[PDB]
């Protein structure tokens, strides 16, 4: 009996930490763009 091989079934992982860090960085830097007449 030779059951089918499934070890090739792989689930990728996502790394969007650069993008989240950029989003928080921009949300912090937008204070430098406020207008103070």
């Amino acid at each position: 009996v030779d059951l089918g091989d499934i070890s090739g079934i792989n689930a990728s992982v996502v790394n969007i930490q650069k993008e989240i860090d950029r989003l928080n960085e921009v949300a912090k830097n937008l204070n430098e763009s406020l207008i103070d007449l």
Partner: protein, 71 residues
């Protein structure tokens, strides 16, 4: 002078918002790609598992029948 300040601050903010929109688009594209790959992985796993369980079932029925024949 105040108009130039308003325009400069607005252009700076629009540049930062453009960067943030590009970052959000990149993150959403990566999340879409990985979620779709994992969906395909789970679907392929379900298919192969259905196959293997059918095979195990056939072998088990055969073994049970051959034990019935033995005894």
């Amino acid at each position: 002078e105040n108009q130039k300040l308003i325009a400069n601050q607005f252009n700076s903010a629009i540049g930062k918002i453009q960067d943030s929109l590009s970052s959000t688009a990149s993150a959403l594209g990566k999340l879409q790609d990985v979620v779709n790959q994992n969906a395909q992985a789970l679907n392929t796993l379900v298919k192969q598992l259905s196959s293997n369980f059918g095979a195990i079932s056939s072998v088990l029925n055969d073994i049970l029948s051959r034990l019935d024949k033995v005894e």
